[PDB]
Amino acid sequence: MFNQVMLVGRLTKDPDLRYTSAGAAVAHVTLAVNRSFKNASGEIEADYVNCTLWRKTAENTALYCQKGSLVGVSGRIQTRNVYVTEVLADTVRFMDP
Amino acid sequence: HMFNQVMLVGRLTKDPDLRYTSAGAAVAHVTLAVNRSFKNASGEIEADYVNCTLWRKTAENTALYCQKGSLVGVSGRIQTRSYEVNVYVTEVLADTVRFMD
Amino acid sequence: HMFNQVMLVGRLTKDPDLRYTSAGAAVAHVTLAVNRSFKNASGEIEADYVNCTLWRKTAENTALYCQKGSLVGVSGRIQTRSYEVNVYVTEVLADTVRFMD
Amino acid sequence: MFNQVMLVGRLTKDPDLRYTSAGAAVAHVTLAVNRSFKNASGEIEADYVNCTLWRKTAENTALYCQKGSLVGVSGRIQTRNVYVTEVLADTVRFMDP
DNA sequence: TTTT
DNA sequence: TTTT
DNA sequence: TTTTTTTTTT
DNA sequence: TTTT
DNA sequence: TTTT
DNA sequence: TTTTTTTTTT
Numbered sequence: 001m002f003n004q005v006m007l008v009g010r011l012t013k014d015p016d017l018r019y020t021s022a023g024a025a026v027a028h029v030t031l032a033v034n035r036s037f038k039n040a041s042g043e044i045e046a047d048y049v050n051c052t053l054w055r056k057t058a059e060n061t062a063l064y065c066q067k068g069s070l071v072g073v074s075g076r077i078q079t080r081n082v083y084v085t086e087v088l089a090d091t092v093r094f095m096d097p
Numbered sequence: 098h099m100f101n102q103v104m105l106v107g108r109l110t111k112d113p114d115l116r117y118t119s120a121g122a123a124v125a126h127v128t129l130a131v132n133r134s135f136k137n138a139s140g141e142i143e144a145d146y147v148n149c150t151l152w153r154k155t156a157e158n159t160a161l162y163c164q165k166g167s168l169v170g171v172s173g174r175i176q177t178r179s180y181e182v183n184v185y186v187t188e189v190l191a192d193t194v195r196f197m198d
Numbered sequence: 199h200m201f202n203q204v205m206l207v208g209r210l211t212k213d214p215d216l217r218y219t220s221a222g223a224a225v226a227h228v229t230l231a232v233n234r235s236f237k238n239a240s241g242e243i244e245a246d247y248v249n250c251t252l253w254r255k256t257a258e259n260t261a262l263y264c265q266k267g268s269l270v271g272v273s274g275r276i277q278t279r280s281y282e283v284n285v286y287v288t289e290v291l292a293d294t295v296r297f298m299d
Numbered sequence: 300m301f302n303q304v305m306l307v308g309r310l311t312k313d314p315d316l317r318y319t320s321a322g323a324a325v326a327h328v329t330l331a332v333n334r335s336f337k338n339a340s341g342e343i344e345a346d347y348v349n350c351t352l353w354r355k356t357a358e359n360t361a362l363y364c365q366k367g368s369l370v371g372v373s374g375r376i377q378t379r380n381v382y383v384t385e386v387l388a389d390t391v392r393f394m395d396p
Numbered sequence: 397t398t399t400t
Numbered sequence: 401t402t403t404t
Numbered sequence: 405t406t407t408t409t410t411t412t413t414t
Numbered sequence: 415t416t417t418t
Numbered sequence: 419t420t421t422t
Numbered sequence: 423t424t425t426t427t428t429t430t431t432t
Contacts, residue, residue, distance in 0.1 A: 049101075
């Protein structure tokens with residue numbers, strides 16, 4: 001029984017690097033992933049996936065990616081009145097030339 | 098330039114919700130409890146609850162064959178939506194589902 | 199009781215091999231170079247070379263649109279075969295492919 | 300650019316636990332995964348996937364699973380005249396009641 | 397060389 | 401506000 | 405630039 | 415609150 | 419015996 | 423027990 005996600009998209013904003021009171025880096029990025037087909041009106045829409053990164057992954061994503069950066073992410077769908085649902089990234093690939 | 102896929106194995110929290118669009122298309126809403134590998138501070142196994150939408154025959158078949166409790170394997174893509182008091186939803190749109198009971 | 203899925207993003211090592219069964223079905227053979235995340239003892243990036251089989255329109259389309267070098271995203275399942283001097287093959291049978299160029 | 304595999308099948312043999320000359324446990328299991336449809340003759344065939352496990356994963360798989368055990372595995376397709384291609388498992392789940 |  |  | 409479909413409510 |  |  | 427198809431050579 002597992003939970004696995006592969007996304008490659010583009011960051012909609014500079015990554016949001018914060019630190020927990022314990023000292024752990026944690027970042028929130030949102031990935032625009034265009035679809036592969038057009039809708040009735042002939043347009044390509046994107047899905048906007050919120051991913052949360054931790055520690056070194058978070059710091060490095062922040063260092064090396066801005067708004068617009070092409071990024072690969074794998075991880076799991078996590079879920080946390082407040083009904084939130086994100087991808088918890090364990091590895092990030094930087095794909096900017 | 099872009100890619101979006103997901104694979105999941107989990108149990109249905111409730112019987113599937115089988116509806117038809119006024120066009121005539123079957124669509125189903127299902128929520129999967131996916132138990133984590135690790136444990137918490139109390140030594141318990143928490144699950145993540147992922148909402149999946151199914152379409153056409155997949156919707157009907159999972160309706161017909163699975164119910165609350167059914168172990169199900171799903172592959173598809175994450176999709177995001179807003180509706181209206183404006184809400185943000187992220188689901189998995191299932192392409193296939195495997196009945197694992 | 200069972201489940202088998204794979205997702206892959208890699209580059210084609212050669213133009214796709216488009217054939218037709220004597221039934222009339224398009225089928226394509228493609229090998230994907232999937233570069234690893236880590237590095238070796240020399241600090242180089244090695245790739246894994248995964249053979250994928252495509253069918254019907256997917257075979258034709260990937261034939262028509264991709265060539266040696268094309269970045270491609272694939273999802274499907276692992277399948278195993280023996281033929282005849284008897285050989286053991288494991289491939290990925292692609293359900294979908296995304297053209298990522 | 301990634302490589303991810305989810306299998307849940309049944310071991311065809313007791314796991315093959317060996318140790319490298321350095322001391323690392325390494326195991327080779329083969330997973331029977333039945334398909335979901337019948338072939339022309341009305342039969343369900345299986346795919347037999349060779350997976351290689353390392354270290355603690357290898358030792359634990361050996362300890363707790365025999366021929367017949369239901370097992371979940373995620374990992375990547377690895378490839379190594381000798382033309383071999385397996386799944387390199389990073390996590391194994393034991394699903395035997 | 398293939399499992400319930 | 402959820403499954404075994 | 406394409407797959408089977410790319411389509412509803414919550 | 416959405417990217418090339 | 420392979421891709422960027 | 424079902425999805426679109428469950429079908430070839432290497």
